[PDB]
Amino acid sequence: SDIQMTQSPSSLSASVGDRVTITCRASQSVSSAVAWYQQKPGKAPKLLIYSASSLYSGVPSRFSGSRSGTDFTLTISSLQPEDFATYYCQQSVSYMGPLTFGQGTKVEIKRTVAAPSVFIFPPSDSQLKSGTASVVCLLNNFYPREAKVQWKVDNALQSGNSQESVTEQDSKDSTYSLSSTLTLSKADYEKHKVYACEVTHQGLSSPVTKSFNRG
């Protein structure tokens, strides 16, 4: 007798000022026992709407909820940059019974294209004592999230020895930043001179390369 909450879409990208509608279908009647939460990465969810359509105190009036039978909707009438989040529906129709959540909808703020600023960092002498060298390339404050980082060592393309991390979308300017870390042994690091990261991004007229010479 599990109640499934089927939330759609799982992800969407929309512009500031757009109307956004998220839907949640319950697999059986949940009466009006549906709440909607907003969660920023790494933070507790925050209540937006309770009992299907009541706006929780302090929540902006651009958020609203509706029920039609077993179909529930959360609408954001005019999306704002701070509305980037994952949104979840949750039912509580069974008293002291199972509470079930939708799978979440990740809302990204679409904005105009912005090219990254690029920086490269050599490994520290402190790290080299340990036998490994990390070389880091930073792509700062860009949109959209898609980017290509290609590492070159003495103009030879690298593959398989790098890992990327991307920040969550900025709540104010809606941009991303990205790090790429190239990991090599100290011995291999000392066999080569020119370390370069080449960045391709749609906001750039052509790829941007930053480099250093070991030493």
Binding site: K43, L47, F101, S124, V136
Partner: protein
């Protein structure tokens, strides 16, 4: 109103942990207290509920028989005793509440339902046989070529630690402009790494000092690393 979770940490598979949820600022006796967890990268999953006034409890099938939820109204505190832990129990555990009543009826109209208005910040439970390892902190030194008045970047690389989490601040929290602390990545080695960077005026280099403050509570580690231009 506040809820504060405690007790999370690293625990071996098959082991046990007791989480606590300390409540303040509301009628704990009348509320309903819930534990809701979030596995890394995954959604919210309800675990258990209790009504402190009566002692009644409820559990998700995934945890029945292994977890016990309880409450002490004398101390306004709820607890989750987790036994026979599995890797699938690794998650951030939140405590949250309903105000009484769970559901009310308006005659000749409908039902009206409570929701989770207050949540704690969450406590991380990591179920693993791997051992705790403290981070090594390395400078990401600003370039010499940040010339004549543009923008420079500098940072700290926080490498090879376990379990999560690490937190990073700059100048003990006084510097937030332009700071980006990246999500940790799991390396193939099984250890985590992350970087934190900040952009500053190129003119500020050489006259300003920048300290990255790294905290890895699982290893009781606090490192304050000064990040300088390399001479």
């Amino acid at each position: 109103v506040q809820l504060v979770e405690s007790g999370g940490g690293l625990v071996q598979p098959g082991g046990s942990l007791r989480l606590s949820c300390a409540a303040s600022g509301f009628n704990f006796y009348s509320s309903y207290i819930h534990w809701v967890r979030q596995a890394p990268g995954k959604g919210l999953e309800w675990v258990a509920s209790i009504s402190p006034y009566s002692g009644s409890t409820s559990y998700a099938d995934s945890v029945k028989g292994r977890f016990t939820i309880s409450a002490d109204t004398s101390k306004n505190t709820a607890y989750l005793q987790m036994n026979s832990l599995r890797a699938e129990d690794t998650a951030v555990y939140y405590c949250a509440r309903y105000s009484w009543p769970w559901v009310s009826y308006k005659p000749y109209y409908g039902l009206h339902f409570s929701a989770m208005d207050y949540w704690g910040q969450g406590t991380l439970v990591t179920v693993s046989s791997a051992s705790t390892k403290g981070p090594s902190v390395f400078p990401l030194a600003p370039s010499s070529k940040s010339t004549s008045g543009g923008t420079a970047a500098l940072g700290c690389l926080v490498k090879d630690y376990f379990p999560e989490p690490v937190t990073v601040s700059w100048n003990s929290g006084a510097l937030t402009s332009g700071v980006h602390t990246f999500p940790a990545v799991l390396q193939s080695s099984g250890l985590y790494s992350l970087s934190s960077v900040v952009t500053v005026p190129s003119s500020s280099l050489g006259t300003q000092t920048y300290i990255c403050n790294v905290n890895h509570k699982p290893s009781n580690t606090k490192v304050d690393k000064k990040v300088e231009p390399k001479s």
